[PDB]
Design a protein around this ligand. Structure first.
Ligand SMILES: CO[C@@]1(C)C[C@@](C)(O)[C@H](O)[C@@H](/C=C\C(C)=C\C[C@H]2O[C@@H](C)[C@H](NC(=O)/C=C\[C@@H](C)OC(C)=O)C[C@@H]2C)O1
Ligand SMILES: [Zn+2]
Ligand SMILES: [Zn+2]
Ligand SMILES: [Zn+2]
Lengths: 66, 441, 815, 209, 81, 111
RNA sequence: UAGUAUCUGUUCUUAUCAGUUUAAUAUCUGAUUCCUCGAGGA
RNA sequence: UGAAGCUUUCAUACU
């Protein structure tokens, strides 16, 4: 429960999906050749891709329900 | 089926680069990081050739690399943070030509994780403390000391955790043998997860937080925290103590800001643009790397934009206060991942893709007619400059690099008997098709 | 109301005799409460409780933390009480307890940070000029703590002012003592302020008062000791006065100046170090003849410090330093002097480490024969230290003869059994090696005489010597009277003292562990039957050595003993596997392996199965361990058929025993099991299909041990097959069964990979029933905590809805 | 000649047959793992070598007999393919090709990486060489651990556990250890350091330079 | 029942009673990695004491090979409270 | 305010994985979507059974676990041959009928 | 020593809805002179 | 064809 990203019987789809999006972005920031792949694919500098991922970290999957 | 793996040609792409006196003598060396390879290089100040001294496979993912030196020592150490849950400190042994592991400290599980530190690594400029940080709430601080045999001792970590917090960059602050300080670009996302309207996601600002380590009381405390005007990328340590003020440079979108705690106001300078630019007008401009050069008389910075333009940044100061930031166009080189300014007047450029470059800094000082921009200049509207061929730098050496390889075909397209390797590599207008042959030239 | 706040701040009793949760709760609440309570009542009550005569250590620690927290909040309101607090806590800084000193320094540091520098100075200044020497020491230590807390440049002006005071010499003395205590307390952190402190204190070396000169020299020595191996251009205005003073002073002040010189010399270059050494060396040679047994210690320390530098070379040392050193310090008066004895030994060893072992070793080796045994032990200690640090490359025929004769005469002339002569004899013989051929007859005669009689405390020392020297004893092709010694050691097998029996067994084992059975003259057939009743002895050393000896005999001389006795010995060793000393268990495992390798797996395995069928729990567990040992020494291809044939017996608690044995077998053999997973798979299927809870629990344990045993060996097919039978048990309520199932799942997470586990969890993660969701999220959290990084490549694709984006687009890029 | 191999962006491999007389494309086999395939190479009529965005190489081989003639069990195809090899490289591979590099040498699998690296995977031909190199790797995993604190077996098992690959970049670090540890390692393999060095050089010069 | 606060340099110890069996999975086969404990569990009179029964420590505490394989050595101070 | 089985069967791409209780979940659309992933074996099917797991029938009598062909050829039931036991175990080794990852075992599946 | 399992015994209107809860049941909570042979049942 | 659950005063076995 103290670890961030764990769930329980009341976990919703939104929390699950934002958790996997957030640690996906962190894994992209960590691995050197995944960021290379993305920066070649979208034709940007690697610093720009890193900053874009950090900016996307705040609200991935949009704002929550109700 | 059982397979044996062999490497024929190692990786040649550079991720991080540090410089220092790693052999203990007066000459300077560079330590570069590949993805999973560590490498020591030494550029010759007589011919300008870059020679490789040592290269080791580490079997991990290097994520942060720093150099530090204790007071009174003549040798630099290497701090590595990786995808393991350990911080490692290394020492180069010139007589054995190998890296000797000095210290190992375990703090968490392995892998590139959200909340396990290893992505960010900062060190105190005097060398008495090191901070390892994750992208999320966890931060750790180690105190570095020395015994009577002049060997390095490490302490147990101090925690500085803070939930629901994202970190963009951490740097150590240069104080005058006062308590060590660390600066962080932070963002709190707790409010954004509770608002279904989506308005707490916006209206959320970065903060510049300062962490003070009290060596007398042995704990880390949050001293200052201020909200910023817009979201910024990496930070730059300003040299302090008895040579310079003690603050930070925040690089941001279209701006660069100087900041210090106390009675110092904020100073902003907009980044100049190229006159008659052909790029989409909706796009902004950020800095991608930086390089500091300290001299016993003065200091300056070298920052590069995404277009590959290096500007020379100086700081107009008072007894203690900073009054202006001045920017001047320096040169245009390929977009680099790291830049190292070496004593004896050499600039090393490690590009994100393609060949790397070593330049001779030919023109010291600045006796020129080109305009110098300032933060004191009024503008309703942005500064403009004209890019030109190299004037301050001379190309001395070029290191080949096959990164990134995108397509390969092994075939005998000439009428030799040995096949050749035809490699489509490179990105943008620096791409090329390379033919590789086994042999010497 | 006044006692209102008192009755409510009995929170400190809430904490003192209280539980940890309410400890921290009351801590936080009293921290919030402090600013309103006021420092007056709070301190008025806490300082008595901290002054309590019988308070504990950790109660004191918690009180100090309370002080820290209530001091951080109320910052500038503590001023009118500072003086009072100090009179309570200016002691605890000269206390003989280290942690009391740490706590007092922490309290004073937090007090100085709460208050200001001016307040501390104004309350501490009146006691600067006091006449009671007990106050001037705590005052200096507290000023040092304040300088360490608030910084050195903040106190530099007050220091510069106080040690220029022309009013009294006590103020100057106390200021210089403050600088000295600052150095002592802060260490190598004074280096940026070294020159400032040195120019502040330097004018005291030429004062008209003799106490000021002494304290200035002591402060210079403290700074130089804190600065080492740096700091020398800051010690420049002191070189002239210090050396002129050692040239003119005489006595206590001379000793202080010489200590300063000695701490300053190792900071120089070769020139200055070489030039300065000459001057202080003529002075020190003159002072070799002075009286106080403090002066000798200081002189020895300075000699050791200076003779360890590069500017001083071995030629000058042997020409000028060694004759007077060895003429004045090496007399038994030094030996009965317990204070400087260790200092003399260390100084002599560190001298030999530069000048060469031969000269020192000769000059003291002629003295190994002496009427006093204190002087003998001293020389022996020094000699063996030099020998261990250098070895003995330069021993000559003459020196070898003298060494051997001396150590032999010293061995016999021994009143009480000491480890000194034993270790000396051992290391001397071990360093000589194959060179001591005739002194081997001599040493054998000596150890024969010592081992023959005299109380078994000499006999056990002789046995230790044999055990540590038998290698070089046989190393020269001399065993024969080696056998003469083994015969006597054999006759010394009935001993009432177990300590001597342990050494006897060790010596016998060391002999036979290098003496071939062919030529081990006591026939193996006779020895062993004499040896088997000793296995029932209850001493640990006797047991371990006996088991090791029987193991060696079974490993090499298996041919002589008729079997049956080996079977009896192994069945007796079976009970030693439960021994509560790791050593005994380790030796028993080794010996059982040797006996099994010797007599063959068939008969011992039949006996072990019979024994597993009929006995109580602990003996059956030991039998299981023994079966695993037999199967590891003799390949499991010899054990598995007979063990699987026993599962065909129709009885309950019989199959469960087979399953427990298989569990421990796989756990014990680990990597060797990669060739035997296909053979036990149908049995595990049957047991996993078995209604009995133990059958499924034990089968899960087997699966876990097998999974963690084979990892990286390509056994994923059978493990996936077995997971197909383990998984349906996740809906089990029995705690032991579900515990074993979780263990097996976490073993399969390593052996099979996290991708398969996520594939098994996906459809249940979001089931409508809460039971399924609880179970699956427990399994998923266990899979997620280990290998969080690998799961990145395994997550399934989830499509975007109208509100939120869920596709990971970067992984869809195609170069 | 007969079959078609399809790479999915997130699924690994689909086997298809073209019915020449019926004019039909029928799926007859697939895999049981999600793979972000970057490139693929055919090794023979039944086996495929694949690469991944996350830096892994894998080999998949079809089971014996099969059908060939077709007219789901996991929401997929009825028949499945087995994974016979798994290896983490550490860099993203974008090219795989089976070829012979030296004149008069043996065929190897050459791969190419996004960081500019080039490497090969070569098959063993005898059990003795395989066992010797396995023991070398085992003993070098313990007495010469990675420099930055990583576990070697755990690094090559980053996303999937290793299967049937020996890391020859760890094995060639034997030639750069100190003589004392080289002797401690060599005396367990019942051999001297020069013999181990010669055996290491033999397999390299058999295939590559 | 486990302390589990991030540790440091203090080396965990075991008493004579259980010397050589894991602290996590209490096992009798193959030790691997040295045990580190938090500073609070080694502070003051607690230094060198057994990580299971707070009694006198005579040997270094170890995690078994199976625990280090499963990275159960990275979960924090295993001193039993 | 909850779907019916036929109503939810009309919304999903794969209606044959929908079951009785699937309309009673907190998020049935995600549940049915995960039930259709191209992998991911289902739940052990006895969660709703009140007879717990296994047991149920003690009628069937099972003979002692039959030894493998080669081991039963070794003639274990006096001169014993070791080389025959070794060579036979390794050289005569055979692979038993393994099962696929998807396949699961139930109480009545052994008959 | 005190925990589990297996036999034996018991096991709650073929009368209707609502609420808590449950996957759904289950559980719990509330409402809805006549016949037969001095008696029983509805 | 089938669905054997729940409880205790039972009684009997294993830890
Ligand atoms: C009664 O005290 C307890 C229960 C608690 C304790 C920790 O305080 C005490 O120290 C501890 C010590 C004695 C016992 C019985 C515990 C550990 C030992 O037990 C023994 C009974 C096993 N026997 C075996 O290991 C089987 C085989 C042998 C030879 O080993 C090996 C490695 O093959 C396992 C273990 C070695 O037991
Ligand atoms: Zn602890
Ligand atoms: Zn204990
Ligand atoms: Zn363990």
């Amino acid at each position: 429960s103290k670890y961030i990203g764990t769930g329980h019987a009341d976990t919703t789809k939104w929390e699950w999906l934002v958790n996997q999006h957030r640690d996906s972005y962190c894994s992209y920031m960590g691995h050197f050749d995944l960021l290379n792949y993305f920066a070649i694919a979208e034709n940007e500098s690697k610093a720009r891709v890193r900053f874009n991922l950090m900016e996307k970290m705040l609200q991935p999957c949009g704002p929550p329900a109700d | 089926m059982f397979l044996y793996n062999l490497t024929l040609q190692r990786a040649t792409g550079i991720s991080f680069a540090i410089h220092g006196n790693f052999s203990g003598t007066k000459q300077q060396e560079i330590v570069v990081s590949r993805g999973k390879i560590l490498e020591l290089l030494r550029p010759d100040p007589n011919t300008g050739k870059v020679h490789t001294l040592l290269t080791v496979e580490v079997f991990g993912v290097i994520r942060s690399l720093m150099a530090f030196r204790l007071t009174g020592g003549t040798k630099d150490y290497i701090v590595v943070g990786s995808d393991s849950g350990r911080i490692v400190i290394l020492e180069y042994q010139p007589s054995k030509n190998m890296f000797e592991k000095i210290h190992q400290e375990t703090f968490g599980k392995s892998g590139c994780r959200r909340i396990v530190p290893g992505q960010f690594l900062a060190v105190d400029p005097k060398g008495r403390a090191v901070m390892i940080s994750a992208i999320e709430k966890q931060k750790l601080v180690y105190i570095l000391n020395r015994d009577a045999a002049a060997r390095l001792t490490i302490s147990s970590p101090l925690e500085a955790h803070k939930a629901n917090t994202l970190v963009y960059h951490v740097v150590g602050v240069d104080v005058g043998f006062e308590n060590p300080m660390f600066a962080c670009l932070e963002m709190d996302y707790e409010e954004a997860d509770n608002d279904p309207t989506g308005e707490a996601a916006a209206n959320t600002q970065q903060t510049l937080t300062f962490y003070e380590l009290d060596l007398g009381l042995n704990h880390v405390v949050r001293k200052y925290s201020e909200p910023l005007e817009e979201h910024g990328n990496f930070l730059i340590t300003v040299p302090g103590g008895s040579d310079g003020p003690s603050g930070v440079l925040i690089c941001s979108e279209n701006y660069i800001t100087y900041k210090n705690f106390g009675d110092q106001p904020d100073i902003r300078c907009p980044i100049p643009r190229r006159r008659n630019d052909l790029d989409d007008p909706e796009r902004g401009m950020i800095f991608v790397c930086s390089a500091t050069h300290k001299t016993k008389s003065m200091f300056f910075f070298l920052a590069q934009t995404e277009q590959g333009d290096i500007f020379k940044i100086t700081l107009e100061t008072d007894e203690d206060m900073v009054t202006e930031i001045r920017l001047k166009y320096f040169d245009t080189v390929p977009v680099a991942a790291a830049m190292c300014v070496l004593k004896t007047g050499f600039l090393f450029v490690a590009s994100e893709f393609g060949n790397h470059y070593l330049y001779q800094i030919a023109h010291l000082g600045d006796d020129d007619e080109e305009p110098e921009f300032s933060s004191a200049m009024p503008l309703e509207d942005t500064f403009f400059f004209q890019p030109r061929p190299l004037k301050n730098l001379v190309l001395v050496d070029e290191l080949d690099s096959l990164s990134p390889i995108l397509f390969c075909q092994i075939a005998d397209l000439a009428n030799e008997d040995t096949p050749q390797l035809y490699v489509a590599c490179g990105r943008g207008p620096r791409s090329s098709l390379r033919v590789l042959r086994h042999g010497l030239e | 109301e006044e006692q209102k706040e008192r009755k409510i701040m009995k929170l400190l009793l809430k904490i003192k005799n209280g539980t940890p949760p309410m400890r921290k709760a009351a801590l936080r609440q009293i921290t919030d409460k402090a600013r309103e309570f006021g420092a007056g009542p709070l301190f008025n009550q806490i300082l008595p409780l901290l002054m309590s005569p019988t308070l504990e250590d950790q109660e004191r620690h918690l009180l100090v933390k309370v002080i820290d927290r209530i001091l951080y909040k109320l910052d500038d309101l503590v001023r009118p009480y500072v003086h009072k607090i100090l009179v309570v806590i200016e002691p605890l800084l000269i206390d003989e307890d280290y942690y009391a000193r740490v706590e007092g320094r922490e309290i004073i540091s937090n007090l100085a940070k709460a208050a200001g520098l001016a307040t501390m100075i104004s309350t501490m200044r009146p006691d600067i000029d006091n006449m009671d020497e007990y106050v001037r020491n705590t005052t200096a230590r507290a000023f040092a703590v304040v300088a360490s807390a608030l910084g050195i440049p903040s106190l530099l002006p007050f220091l510069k002012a106080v040690c220029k005071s022309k009013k009294s010499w006590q103020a100057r003395h106390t200021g210089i003592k403050i600088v000295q205590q600052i150095a002592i307390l802060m260490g190598c952190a004074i280096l940026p302020h070294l020159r400032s402190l040195v120019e502040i204190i330097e004018h005291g070396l030429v004062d008209e008062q003799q106490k000021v000169r002494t304290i200035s020299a002591l402060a210079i020595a403290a700074l130089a000791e804190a600065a080492t191996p740096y700091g020398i251009e800051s010690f420049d205005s002191v070189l002239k006065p210090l050396w002129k003073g050692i040239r003119q002073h005489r006595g206590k002040g001379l000793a202080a100046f010489l200590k300063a010189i000695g701490y300053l010399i190792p900071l120089m270059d070769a020139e200055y170090a070489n030039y300065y050494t000459r001057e202080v060396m003529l002075i020190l040679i003159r002072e070799f003849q002075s009286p106080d047994e403090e002066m000798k210690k200081i002189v020895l320390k300075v000699v050791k410090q200076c003779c360890g530098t590069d500017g001083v070379e071995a030629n000058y040392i042997k020409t000028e330093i060694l004759p007077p050193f060895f003429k004045h310090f090496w007399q038994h008066r030094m030996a009965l002097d317990r204070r400087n004895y260790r200092q003399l030994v260390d100084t002599t060893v560190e001298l030999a480490n530069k000048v060469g072992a031969a000269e020192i070793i000769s000059r003291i080796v002629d003295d190994l024969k002496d009427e006093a045994e204190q002087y003998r032990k001293m020389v022996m200690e020094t000699i063996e230290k030099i020998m261990g640090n250098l070895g003995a490359a330069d021993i000559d025929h003459k020196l070898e003869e003298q060494l051997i004769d001396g150590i032999l005469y010293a061995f016999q002339e021994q009143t009480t059994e000491d480890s000194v002569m034993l270790n000396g004899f051992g290391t001397v013989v071990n360093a000589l090696g194959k060179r001591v051929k005739p002194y081997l007859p001599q040493i054998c005669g000596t150890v024969l005489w010592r081992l023959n009689n005299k109380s078994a405390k000499v006999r056990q020392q002789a046995a230790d010597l044999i055990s540590r020297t038998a290698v070089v004893m046989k190393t020269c092709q001399e065993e024969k009277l080696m056998g003469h010694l083994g015969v006597v050691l054999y006759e010394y097998l009935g001993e009432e003292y177990p300590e001597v029996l342990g050494s006897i067994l060790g010596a016998l084992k060391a002999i036979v562990n290098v003496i071939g059975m062919h030529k081990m003259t006591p026939p193996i057939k006779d020895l062993l039957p004499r040896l088997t009743p000793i296995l029932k002895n209850r001493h640990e050393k006797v047991q371990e050595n006996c088991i090791d000896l029987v193991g060696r005999i079974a490993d090499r001389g298996a041919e002589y003993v008729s079997a049956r006795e080996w079977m009896r010995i192994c069945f007796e060793l079976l009970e030693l596997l439960k021994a509560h000393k790791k050593a005994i268990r380790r030796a028993t495992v080794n010996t059982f392996g040797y006996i099994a390798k010797a007599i063959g797996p068939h008969d011992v395995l039949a006996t072990l199965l019979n024994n597993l069928k009929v006995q109580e729990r602990q003996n059956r567990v030991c039998t299981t361990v023994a079966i695993a040992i037999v199967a590891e020494t003799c390949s499991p291809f010899t054990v598995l058929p007979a063990l699987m044939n026993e599962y065909r017996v129709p009885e309950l608690n019989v199959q469960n025993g087979v399953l427990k044995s298989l569990s421990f077998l796989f756990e014990y053999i680990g990597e060797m099991g990669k060739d035997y997973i296909y053979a036990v798979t149908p049995l595990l299927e049957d047991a996993l299909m078995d209604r009995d809870l133990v059958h499924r629990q034990t089968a899960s344990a087997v699966v876990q041990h097998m999974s963690l045993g084979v990892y990286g060996f390509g056994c994923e097919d059978s493990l996936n097959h077995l997971l197909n039978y383990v998984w349906p048990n996740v809906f089990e309520t029995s705690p032991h069964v579900i515990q074993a199932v979780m263990g097996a799942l976490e073993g399969l997470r390593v052996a099979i990979g996290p991708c398969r586990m996520l594939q098994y969890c996906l459809q249940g993660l979001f089931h409508p029933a809460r039971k399924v969701r609880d179970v699956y999220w427990k399994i998923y959290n266990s899979i997620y905590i280990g290998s969080q990084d690998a799961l990145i490549a395994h997550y399934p694709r989830i499509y975007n809805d109208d509100k939120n984006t869920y596709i990971r687009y970067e992984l869809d890029y195609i170069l | 000649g007969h079959r078609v191999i399809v790479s999915d962006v997130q699924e690994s491999f689909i086997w298809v047959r073209y019915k020449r007389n019926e004019n039909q494309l029928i799926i007859f086999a697939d895999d049981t793992y999600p793979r972000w395939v970057t490139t693929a190479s055919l090794l023979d009529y039944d086996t495929v070598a694949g690469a991944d965005k996350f830096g892994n190489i894998c080999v998949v081989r079809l089971p014996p007999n099969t059908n060939d003639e077709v007219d789901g069990l996991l929401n997929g195809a009825s028949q499945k393919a087995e994974v016979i090899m798994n290896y983490h490289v550490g860099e993203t591979v974008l090219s795989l090709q089976k070829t012979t590099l030296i004149p008069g040498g043996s065929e190897s699998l050459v791969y190419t990486t996004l960081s500019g690296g080039i490497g090969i995977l070569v098959p063993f031909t005898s059990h003795e060489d395989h066992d010797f190199f396995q023991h070398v790797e085992m003993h070098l995993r313990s007495e010469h651990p990675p420099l930055c604190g990583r576990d070697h077996l755990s690094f090559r098992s980053y996303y999937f556990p290793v299967k049937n690959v020996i890391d020859g970049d760890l094995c060639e670090q034997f030639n750069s250890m100190e003589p004392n540890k080289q002797k401690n390692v060599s005396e367990e393999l019942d051999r001297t350091p020069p013999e181990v060095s010669k055996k290491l050089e033999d397999i390299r010069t058999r295939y590559a330079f | 029942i486990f302390c589990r606060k991030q540790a440091g340099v203090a080396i965990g110890r075991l008493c004579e009673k259980c010397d050589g069996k894991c602290v996590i999975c209490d096992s009798y086969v193959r030790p691997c990695t040295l045990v580190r404990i938090c500073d609070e569990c080694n502070y003051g009179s607690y230094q060198g004491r057994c990580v299971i029964c707070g009694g006198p420590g005579v040997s270094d505490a170890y995690y078994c090979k199976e625990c280090t394989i499963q990275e159960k050595d990275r979960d924090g101070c295993p001193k039993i409270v | 305010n909850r779907f019916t089985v036929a109503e939810l069967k009309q919304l999903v791409a794969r209606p044959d994985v929908v079951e009785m209780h699937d309309v009673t979940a907190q998020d049935p659309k995600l549940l049915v979507h995960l039930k259709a992933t191209r992998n991911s074996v289902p739940v052990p099917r006895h969660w709703c059974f009140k007879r717990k797991y296994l047991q149920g029938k003690r009628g069937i009598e099972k003979p002692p676990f039959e030894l493998p062909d080669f081991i039963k050829r070794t003639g274990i039931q006096i001169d014993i041959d070791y080389q025959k036991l070794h060579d036979a175990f390794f050289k005569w080794q055979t692979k038993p009928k393994l099962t696929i990852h998807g396949d699961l075992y139930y109480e009545g599946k052994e008959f």
